[PDB]
Amino acid sequence: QRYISIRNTDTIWLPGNICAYQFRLDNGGNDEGFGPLTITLQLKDKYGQTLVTRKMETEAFGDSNATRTTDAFLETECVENVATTEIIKATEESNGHRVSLPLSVFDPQDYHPLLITVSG
Amino acid sequence: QRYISIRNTDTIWLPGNICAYQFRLDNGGNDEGFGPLTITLQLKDKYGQTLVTRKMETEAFGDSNATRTTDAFLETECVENVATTEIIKATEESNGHRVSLPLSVFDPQDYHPLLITV
Ligand SMILES: [Cl-]
Ligand code: NA
């Protein structure tokens, strides 16, 4: 139906040994938007073993052009060698109502990208 | 000055063992665009050692609201152990001249992201 590209854009080290993984969600400029989302992710090590399962909440976005993206944060104890995350469930707050969101909507970054630096 | 965010968005395996590294460039929504760019990249292993040095060319962009971003591809013999790339030079085709582009303009993705599956 609708489109959400999703990728991890940063990792923030917080007090209390918490790591906050920042995800940017983007509707690609299709300005058919989304209500508040609830996303459940399995955090996995490099071997593919499940570490923890956590939920992530997003604001409503995408019904306009300068609201095409929104940022969400996933919190867990930073003591985990997290390498990948798998979206296993998603919920949309629309109409003040609980509605299930099809996982096919997501366009995840399922590839290790080249890191880019700039010379001095 | 001007702004270009840049990140690697996919790797495409081609016949003849060629790899196409896809880059997304974004001028952040400014009304000042860029002529065709020629970008020189050091492809490096994970240890930071330079493997090969290659050039990447882009279309002109940032000059209309539907060209705020552009996608470029770097084709090379799909070279084993590339982990990172470093921008060491950039040249802009502007007004009949090849002009040097200050590297400070670039806002690179200098971060290893979590992989996401569904
Ligand atoms: Cl044209
Ligand atoms: Na440690």
Distance A14 CA to ligand 2 centre (A): 14
CA torsion sign, B114 to A72 to A98 to A35?
A: negative
Q: Which residues pair with B69 in a beta bridge?
A: B26
CB-nearest to A112 from B42, B104, B115 is B115
The residues, ordered by sequence, that sit 6+ positions from B15 with a Cβ below 8 Å of its Cβ are: none
Whether residues A110 and B116 touch (CB distance < 8 A) is answered with yes
| Residue A86 burial (CB count, 10 A) | 18
**Contact B109/B87 with Cβ under 8 angstroms?**
no
The residues, ordered by sequence, that sit 6+ positions from B49 with a Cβ below 8 Å of its Cβ are: none
**How far is Cα A91 from Cα A107, in angstroms, rounded to an integer?**
16
Q: Which residues pair with A99 in a beta bridge?
A: A92
Beta-carbon contacts below 8 Å between A and B = 98
Q: Residue B38 in 3-state DSSP? A: strand
CA dihedral angle for residue A28, residue A34, residue A37, residue A39, rounded to 10 degrees: -40
Q: Residue B13 in 3-state DSSP? A: strand
**What tokens does A94 get?**
């629309």
In whole angstroms, what separates CA B94 from the centre of its chain? Answer: 18
User: For chain A, what is the HEC assignment?
Assistant: CCCEEEEEEEEEEECCCEEEEEEEEECCCCCCCECCEEEEEEEECCCCCEEEEEEEEECCECCCCCCCEEEEEEEEECCCCCCEEEEEEEEEEECCEEEECCHHHEEECCCCCCEEEECC
* Resolution attained, angstroms: 2.3
DSSP codes joined into one string, B41-89: EEEE-TTS-EEEEEEEE---BSSSTTSSEEEEEEEEE--TT--EEEEEE
